[PDB]
Scaffold this motif. Structure first.
Motif, PDB file in Angstrom:
ATOM      1  N   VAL A  40      17.693  30.676  56.521  1.00 41.44           N
ATOM      2  CA  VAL A  40      16.489  31.466  56.262  1.00 41.44           C
ATOM      3  C   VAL A  40      16.877  32.631  55.363  1.00 41.44           C
ATOM      4  N   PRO A  41      16.229  32.811  54.213  1.00 38.38           N
ATOM      5  CA  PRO A  41      16.631  33.892  53.313  1.00 38.38           C
ATOM      6  C   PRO A  41      16.483  35.229  54.013  1.00 38.38           C
ATOM      7  N   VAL A  42      17.377  36.157  53.669  1.00 33.66           N
ATOM      8  CA  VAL A  42      17.322  37.488  54.253  1.00 33.66           C
ATOM      9  C   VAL A  42      15.934  38.064  54.018  1.00 33.66           C
ATOM     10  N   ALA A  43      15.274  38.469  55.098  1.00 31.01           N
ATOM     11  CA  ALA A  43      13.936  39.023  54.983  1.00 31.01           C
ATOM     12  C   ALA A  43      13.981  40.315  54.179  1.00 31.01           C
ATOM     13  N   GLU A  44      12.920  40.553  53.407  1.00 31.42           N
ATOM     14  CA  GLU A  44      12.859  41.767  52.600  1.00 31.42           C
ATOM     15  C   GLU A  44      12.890  43.006  53.485  1.00 31.42           C
ATOM     16  N   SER A  45      12.056  43.029  54.528  1.00 30.17           N
ATOM     17  CA  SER A  45      12.116  44.118  55.497  1.00 30.17           C
ATOM     18  C   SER A  45      13.438  44.109  56.253  1.00 30.17           C
ATOM     19  N   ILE A  46      13.920  42.921  56.626  1.00 22.17           N
ATOM     20  CA  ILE A  46      15.193  42.819  57.334  1.00 22.17           C
ATOM     21  C   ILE A  46      16.344  43.272  56.445  1.00 22.17           C
ATOM     22  N   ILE A  47      16.320  42.883  55.168  1.00 21.72           N
ATOM     23  CA  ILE A  47      17.383  43.276  54.246  1.00 21.72           C
ATOM     24  C   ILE A  47      17.423  44.790  54.082  1.00 21.72           C
ATOM     25  N   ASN A  48      16.252  45.424  53.974  1.00 22.07           N
ATOM     26  CA  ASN A  48      16.206  46.875  53.826  1.00 22.07           C
ATOM     27  C   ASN A  48      16.772  47.578  55.053  1.00 22.07           C
ATOM     28  N   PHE A  49      16.434  47.089  56.249  1.00 20.16           N
ATOM     29  CA  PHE A  49      16.923  47.717  57.472  1.00 20.16           C
ATOM     30  C   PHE A  49      18.437  47.600  57.595  1.00 20.16           C
ATOM     31  N   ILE A  50      18.992  46.429  57.268  1.00 21.20           N
ATOM     32  CA  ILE A  50      20.438  46.237  57.369  1.00 21.20           C
ATOM     33  C   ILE A  50      21.172  47.166  56.411  1.00 21.20           C
ATOM     34  N   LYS A  51      20.716  47.230  55.157  1.00 20.75           N
ATOM     35  CA  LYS A  51      21.238  48.235  54.237  1.00 20.75           C
ATOM     36  C   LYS A  51      20.904  49.636  54.729  1.00 20.75           C
ATOM     37  N   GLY A  52      19.681  49.828  55.227  1.00 18.58           N
ATOM     38  CA  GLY A  52      19.340  51.090  55.858  1.00 18.58           C
ATOM     39  C   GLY A  52      20.209  51.376  57.066  1.00 18.58           C
ATOM     40  N   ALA A  53      20.573  50.332  57.813  1.00 15.70           N
ATOM     41  CA  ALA A  53      21.600  50.501  58.831  1.00 15.70           C
ATOM     42  C   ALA A  53      22.916  50.930  58.198  1.00 15.70           C
ATOM     43  N   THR A  54      23.417  50.143  57.240  1.00 21.20           N
ATOM     44  CA  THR A  54      24.778  50.331  56.742  1.00 21.20           C
ATOM     45  C   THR A  54      24.993  51.726  56.162  1.00 21.20           C
ATOM     46  N   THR A  94      26.696  44.275  66.071  1.00 21.22           N
ATOM     47  CA  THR A  94      26.777  45.662  65.623  1.00 21.22           C
ATOM     48  C   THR A  94      25.426  46.152  65.115  1.00 21.22           C
ATOM     49  N   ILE A  95      24.920  45.532  64.046  1.00 20.06           N
ATOM     50  CA  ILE A  95      23.690  45.999  63.409  1.00 20.06           C
ATOM     51  C   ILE A  95      22.486  45.788  64.319  1.00 20.06           C
ATOM     52  N   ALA A  96      22.477  44.698  65.079  1.00 24.13           N
ATOM     53  CA  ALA A  96      21.351  44.387  65.949  1.00 24.13           C
ATOM     54  C   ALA A  96      21.842  44.012  67.339  1.00 24.13           C
ATOM     55  N   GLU A  97      20.950  43.484  68.172  1.00 22.17           N
ATOM     56  CA  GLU A  97      21.319  42.999  69.493  1.00 22.17           C
ATOM     57  C   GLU A  97      21.058  41.503  69.557  1.00 22.17           C
ATOM     58  N   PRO A  98      22.071  40.671  69.810  1.00 21.75           N
ATOM     59  CA  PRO A  98      21.811  39.230  69.923  1.00 21.75           C
ATOM     60  C   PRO A  98      21.120  38.893  71.231  1.00 21.75           C
ATOM     61  N   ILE A  99      19.818  38.609  71.163  1.00 24.80           N
ATOM     62  CA  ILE A  99      19.051  38.346  72.376  1.00 24.80           C
ATOM     63  C   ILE A  99      19.461  37.017  72.995  1.00 24.80           C
ATOM     64  N   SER A 100      19.663  35.998  72.168  1.00 28.64           N
ATOM     65  CA  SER A 100      20.045  34.671  72.628  1.00 28.64           C
ATOM     66  C   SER A 100      21.494  34.408  72.247  1.00 28.64           C
ATOM     67  N   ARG A 101      22.244  33.807  73.165  1.00 30.29           N
ATOM     68  CA  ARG A 101      23.602  33.333  72.899  1.00 30.29           C
ATOM     69  C   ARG A 101      23.706  31.882  73.351  1.00 30.29           C
ATOM     70  N   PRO A 102      22.788  31.031  72.898  1.00 29.01           N
ATOM     71  CA  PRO A 102      22.770  29.644  73.373  1.00 29.01           C
ATOM     72  C   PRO A 102      23.952  28.855  72.835  1.00 29.01           C
ATOM     73  N   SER A 103      24.251  27.756  73.534  1.00 31.36           N
ATOM     74  CA  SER A 103      25.385  26.922  73.153  1.00 31.36           C
ATOM     75  C   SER A 103      25.192  26.329  71.764  1.00 31.36           C
ATOM     76  N   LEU A 125      21.124  49.385  65.025  1.00 31.66           N
ATOM     77  CA  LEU A 125      21.088  49.630  63.585  1.00 31.66           C
ATOM     78  C   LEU A 125      21.883  50.878  63.226  1.00 31.66           C
ATOM     79  N   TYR A 126      21.681  51.965  63.973  1.00 33.63           N
ATOM     80  CA  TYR A 126      22.550  53.128  63.829  1.00 33.63           C
ATOM     81  C   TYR A 126      23.970  52.801  64.273  1.00 33.63           C
ATOM     82  N   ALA A 127      24.108  52.024  65.351  1.00 30.83           N
ATOM     83  CA  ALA A 127      25.433  51.616  65.809  1.00 30.83           C
ATOM     84  C   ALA A 127      26.093  50.660  64.827  1.00 30.83           C
ATOM     85  N   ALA A 128      25.329  49.706  64.289  1.00 30.81           N
ATOM     86  CA  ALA A 128      25.841  48.875  63.203  1.00 30.81           C
ATOM     87  C   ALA A 128      25.970  49.682  61.922  1.00 30.81           C
ATOM     88  N   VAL A 129      25.091  50.667  61.736  1.00 32.44           N
ATOM     89  CA  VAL A 129      25.309  51.654  60.686  1.00 32.44           C
ATOM     90  C   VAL A 129      26.551  52.475  60.988  1.00 32.44           C
TER      91      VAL A 129
END
Ligand SMILES: [Zn+2]
Ligand SMILES: [Zn+2]
Ligand SMILES: [Zn+2]
Ligand SMILES: [Zn+2]
Lengths: 222, 351, 290
Positions: C103-117, C59-68, C80-84
């Motif tokens: 991996v801890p939620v990235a500061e820029s990544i965390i802002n975008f996800i909330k910015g998405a939501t 929703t929020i992003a696009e999963p580029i890899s779907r490995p086993s 992000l708008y769609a996940a928003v």
């Protein structure tokens, strides 16, 4: 009931379904002492009530829309029935709110291919107004329930089968309830008594109708 | 916390002689997707395993194999004490794909008459692995169950993840009323253990039947290999056996003699019946704070037994699953292994 | 002029360091490992909520890899708008991400996800009488609508009408923001100017689609037969546009040659209401109709 309430002293009111236990003292105008119900204390789940509001299309469903066809809801209903016929063991029953609902929906269910599929899996045994045919249906439902090929018995929530007939281990596995049985499909006689229910008692239209609708809804599930 | 049994109510008679006849389902429903390849393919994998198991613990027995295709049951391996016939028969079947309906009335009807030659001392048995949810009966099936229960042919069947009242009934009816025989899986290992459990004799509470004294003799290996010769295969076998009564060269088999017809056995088969007949008592799991025995095992030497007071780790359980009649400790491994392969309780043997 | 990066802003947020970027503290106890700098979210076999995690990432992003073993993570502004527009709690996704993502939620990544939501539209486009108007659930929304040449000037003074909001929703504004707030009924003409001015002034408006304000009249000559070919992506695409209960037209990016019109005919029939079909060129209109 007033004379037997006037006549008799020690009476008991008992059912598997009575709900609420207070609508009766209201309507029947009588005095109670232990309006007590008991919960089912079980070491296991033993049954599944589900609320299928939505179909696969995530579409809310009902028989309240009409007593008629709307290919969305009908095919949605047709999809739910055929998949339930695939999954439940021998003994499955459903309850239309009204027979004229049953007649219309079923007739055009044979129109589509939904009836042939359940005919591959189970037996299908309709509820006819003449109950000798209905009896000839019901026992062959129970017989097929106790036999191998699955038996599907489809009736009306307000019909005769719900009054006295039981559905045991095999004679009933997955009951269904397509929409909620309501009666203002018909004329204003309920309105008149409901008006009395509204004027003589402090009982509204919807509260009375949902109580009766869930009174027979509770009556069918048990 | 323990998952161990309370009491066995049948070490007295086991059905030591058997004629078990396993029947499969090659029907469309086996092509649905619940079991890893499907029903059809993974069922057949465990049947092969059971086949190997069934003749290892009941090698005096025979089996036949029947498939269930297209509303028609179809024998694929004759009732035989030779598993390889059945094994090879099973190898071909998976290569064909299941089809049509299971017509149980068909399958029951040929199973019942297949077991008529099976004598009184040999036990008739049928094992249905049912996986579809509908049948197609050529006739009355109660007629057949009534005919089936009349022929002293008990029926235990293993339904898939569903319960069917008729095979509830069939296992109920044939198995002397004692319905214990429509046990059904939720799981492959549950299916796997469903297969392994069908190997041993099946006693619940035996009625008094003619206990018949059975006359046989024992064969002996042949030596001359250049004289490769056979009276049971009419080929050049570099040495076979000789029946004690017929005096004809018979290839290596517990199979009956083919010239005078007496069951050929060496010694090995009956001692599986012994530990079938009279098994042991279960290794009791000793109390944690009341054991105070050697900080080791007995059948092996397993110094792991505790850690001596560890608040949680010690108050848990003391790995001292010990047999009773010997009163000797056994690590769960040994206690499991002692109860697994060699009954032969190590403590109870040495005294 | 009138170009928005936010719709096409997908393709970034994959760059981190090793000195500044530390191993995620969840990395020890975290089913995933949200590489915030690389924007990658590897959903290994150790994630118990991998299905739950897999859906949230889609929703929020696009999963580029779907490995086993593990999946892959990519950033999409439309996602992000769609996940928003997905509606998942921006904080709730991050924490299950933070707890799951080793991996801890990235500061820029965390802002975008909330910015998405929450962002991806904080606009206030109010609606009156089950329609679209120039108003807002939030105040900066009513200001945007009233001060709007198309939203306000094209908006009739009437606050709302059951029929006018029903009919007119200054075109159809069945894509407006939260209704049942203060607004005025807009005319029957020209939401280009409504959108062409929210265009010029960059009003990302938190929009809806009120699908039975797709009412629009006594029922047309529509033959509600499903005999047109139905095959599974179309129906769940329909189930997406049919949403909860009744037919919502969304944006459903469909291919020409795989039964594209088939969802439209069904949704047109399902509403049982007047519908027009527009194809590329008239010659294709006949070809498609043929
Ligand atoms: Zn030979
Ligand atoms: Zn011999
Ligand atoms: Zn040991
Ligand atoms: Zn012992």
């Amino acid at each position: 009931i007033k004379p037997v309430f006037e006549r008799f002293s020690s009476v008991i009111i008992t059912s598997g379904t009575i709900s609420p236990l207070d609508m009766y003292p209201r309507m029947l105008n009588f005095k109670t002492v232990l309006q007590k119900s008991y919960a089912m204390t079980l070491a296991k789940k033993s049954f599944l009530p589900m609320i299928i509001t939505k179909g696969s299309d995530q579409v809310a469903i009902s028989s309240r829309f009409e007593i008629r066809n709307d290919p969305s809801i009908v095919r949605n209903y047709g999809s739910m029935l055929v998949e339930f016929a695939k999954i439940t063991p021998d003994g499955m029953v459903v309850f239309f709110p009204s027979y004229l609902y049953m007649e219309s929906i079923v007739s055009m269910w044979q129109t589509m291919g939904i009836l042939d599929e359940v005919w591959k899996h189970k037996l299908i045994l309709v509820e006819t107004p003449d109950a000798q045919e209905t009896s000839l249906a019901l026992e062959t439902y129970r017989k097929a329930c106790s036999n191998g090929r699955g038996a599907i018995l489809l009736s009306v929530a307000r019909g005769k089968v719900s009054e006295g007939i039981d559905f045991d281990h095999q004679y009933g596995r997955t009951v269904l309830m397509i929409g909620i049985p309501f009666q203002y499909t018909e004329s204003r006689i309920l309105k008149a008594r409901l008006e009395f229910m509204r004027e003589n008692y402090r009982i509204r239209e919807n509260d009375f109708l949902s109580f009766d609708a869930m009174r027979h809804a509770a009556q069918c599930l048990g | 916390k323990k998952r161990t049994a309370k009491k066995n109510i049948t070490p007295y008679q086991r059905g030591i002689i058997r004629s078990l006849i396993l029947t499969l389902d090659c029907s469309e429903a086996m092509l649905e997707k619940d079991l890893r390849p499907n029903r059809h393919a993974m069922i057949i994998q465990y049947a092969i395993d059971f086949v190997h198991e069934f003749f290892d613990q009941n090698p005096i027995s025979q089996m036949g194999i029947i498939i269930m295709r297209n509303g028609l049951a179809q024998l694929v391996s004759q009732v035989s004490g030779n598993p390889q016939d059945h094994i090879d028969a099973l190898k071909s079947i998976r290569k064909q794909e299941p089809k049509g309906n299971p017509s149980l009335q068909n399958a029951l009807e040929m199973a019942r008459g297949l077991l008529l030659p099976v004598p009184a001392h040999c036990t008739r048995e049928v094992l249905i692995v049912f996986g579809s949810l509908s049948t197609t009966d050529p006739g009355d099936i109660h007629q057949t169950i009534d005919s089936l229960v009349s022929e002293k042919i008990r029926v235990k069947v293993l339904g898939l993840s569903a319960q069917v009242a008729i095979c509830k009934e069939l296992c109920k009816a044939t198995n002397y009323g004692d319905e214990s025989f429509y046990k059904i899986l939720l799981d492959e290992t549950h299916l796997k253990e469903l297969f392994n459990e069908a190997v041993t004799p099946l006693p619940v509470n035996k009625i008094n039947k003619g206990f018949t004294l059975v006359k046989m003799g024992f064969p002996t290996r042949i030596f001359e290999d250049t004289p490769t010769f056979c009276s049971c295969h009419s080929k050049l076998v570099y040495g076979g056996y000789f029946c004690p009564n017929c005096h004809s060269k018979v290839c290596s088999l517990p199979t009956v003699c083919p010239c005078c017809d007496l069951m050929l056995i060496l010694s090995t088969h009956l001692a599986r019946s012994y530990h079938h007949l009279m098994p042991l008592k279960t290794f009791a799991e000793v109390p944690t704070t009341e054991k105070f025995r050697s900080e080791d095992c007995f059948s092996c030497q397993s110094r792991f037994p505790x850690x001596x007071x560890x608040x949680x780790x010690x108050x848990x359980x003391x790995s001292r699953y010990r047999c009773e009649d010997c009163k000797q400790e056994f690590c769960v491994d040994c206690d499991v292994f002692i109860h697994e392969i060699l009954h032969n309780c190590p403590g109870c043997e040495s005294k | 002029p009138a170009d928005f990066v936010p719709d096409s802003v997908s393709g970034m947020f994959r760059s981190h360091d090793f000195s500044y970027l530390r191993l995620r503290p969840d990395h020890a106890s975290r089913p995933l490992w949200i590489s915030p700098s690389d924007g990658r979210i590897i959903l290994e076999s150790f994630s118990p909520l991998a299905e739950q995690a897999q859906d949230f990432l889609v929703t929020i992003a696009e999963p580029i890899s779907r490995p086993s073993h593990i999946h892959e993570y990519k950033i999409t502004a439309y996602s992000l708008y769609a996940a928003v527009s997905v509606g998942l709690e921006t904080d709730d996704i991050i924490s299950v991400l933070d707890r799951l993502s080793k991996v801890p939620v990235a500061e820029s990544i965390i802002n975008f996800i909330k910015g998405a939501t929450i962002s991806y539209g904080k606009v206030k486009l109010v609606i009156k009488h089950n329609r679209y108007f120039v108003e807002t659930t939030q105040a900066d929304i009513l200001q945007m609508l009233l001060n709007d040449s198309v939203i306000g000037p094209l908006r009739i003074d009437s606050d709302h009408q059951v029929q006018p909001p029903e009919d007119v929703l200054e075109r159809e504004e069945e894509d407006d923001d939260i209704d049942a707030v203060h607004s005025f009924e807009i005319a029957n003409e020209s939401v280009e100017v409504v959108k062409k001015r929210c265009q010029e002034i960059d009003y990302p408006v938190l929009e809806e689609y009120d699908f039975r304000n797709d009412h629009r009249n006594p029922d047309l000559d529509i033959d509600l037969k499903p005999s047109t070919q139905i095959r599974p992506y179309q129906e769940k695409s329909l189930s997406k546009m049919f949403g909860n209960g009744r037919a919502r037209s969304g944006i459903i990016v469909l291919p020409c040659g795989a039964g594209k019109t088939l969802v439209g005919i069904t949704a047109a029939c399902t509403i049982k209401k007047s519908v027009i079909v527009l194809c590329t060129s008239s010659v294709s209109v006949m070809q498609w109709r043929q």
